[PDB]
Design a protein around this ligand. Structure first.
Ligand SMILES: *[C@@H](O)C(CC)(CC)C(=O)Nc1ccc(C)nc1
Ligand code: NA
Length: 240
């Protein structure tokens, strides 16, 4: 997250760290959202590679075990069947991970609230991106979970020629684009939390930013629109 601040510890308790094994160590690669005790929602492109993955719930500081963390393997990866890694702009950047064990819910580990099917937010709606991603374009991962305010940019504006043009589809949510605050490498797959009737719900899965950089004016961070995939999500959980 570029232009963010350290989140209050465990204040986004559905945020997970998706990690892969490298030799004998683990490395953070993407975010995700805990949506059942044994299911995580993330981006398809995060699980493109044939790596050994684990999920960390209750995480805050990636470089120390503070006592709130639970570490669990990934048993099954269900990528959206229309996902095409050659064409992130075509969409379907979403995947569900079935965990090897059900995590224990507590103050630090909670299920994320998803929006009702088809829900669309008004332009400039209040949302926050969270993650351990780079804190500047070509910088380094955050040690501690970051948050930044990223208000939505509605589809008509986001897909206009002065923003993303036809690169963005109505199955995506745009947010930010002020040139200051954004998602960045390592935030992919994580949540966009948007405030609706007093409650935060995960309306986005972080998918892409500009090739020019993370925080680029009128190139808002682009998310998979979770509310476009509610049926798909429930179908996967019911049949896996
Ligand atoms: C996620 O960390 C992000 C960093 C540039 C977007 C914020 C990313 O990796 N997006 C991405 C990578 C690869 C493909 C095929 N699509 C999207
Ligand atoms: Na930790």
């Amino acid at each position: 997250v570029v232009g963010g601040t350290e989140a209050q510890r465990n204040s986004w308790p559905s945020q997970i760290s998706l990690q892969y094994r490298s030799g004998s160590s683990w490395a953070h690669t993407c975010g995700g959202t805990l949506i059942r005790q044994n299911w995580v929602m993330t981006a398809a492109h995060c699980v493109d590679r044939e790596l050994t993955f684990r999920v960390v719930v209750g995480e805050h500081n990636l470089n120390q075990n503070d006592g709130t963390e639970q570490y669990v393997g990934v048993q099954k990866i269900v990528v959206h069947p229309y996902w095409n890694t050659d064409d992130v702009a075509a969409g379907y950047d979403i995947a569900l991970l079935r965990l090897a064990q059900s995590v224990t819910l507590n103050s630090y580990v909670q299920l994320g609230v998803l929006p009702r099917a088809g829900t669309i937010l008004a332009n400039n709606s209040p949302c926050y991106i969270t993650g351990w991603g780079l804190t500047r374009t070509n910088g380094q991962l955050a040690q501690t979970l970051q948050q930044a305010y990223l208000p939505t940019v509605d589809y008509a504006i986001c897909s206009s020629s002065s923003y993303w043009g036809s690169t963005v589809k109505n199955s995506m949510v745009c947010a930010g684009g002020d040139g200051v605050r954004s998602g960045c490498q390592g935030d992919s797959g994580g949540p966009l939390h948007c405030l609706v009737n007093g409650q935060y719900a995960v309306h986005g899965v972080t998918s892409f930013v500009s090739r020019l950089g993370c925080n680029v004016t009128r190139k808002p961070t682009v998310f998979t629109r979770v509310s476009a995939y509610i049926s798909w999500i429930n179908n996967v959980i019911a049949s896996n």
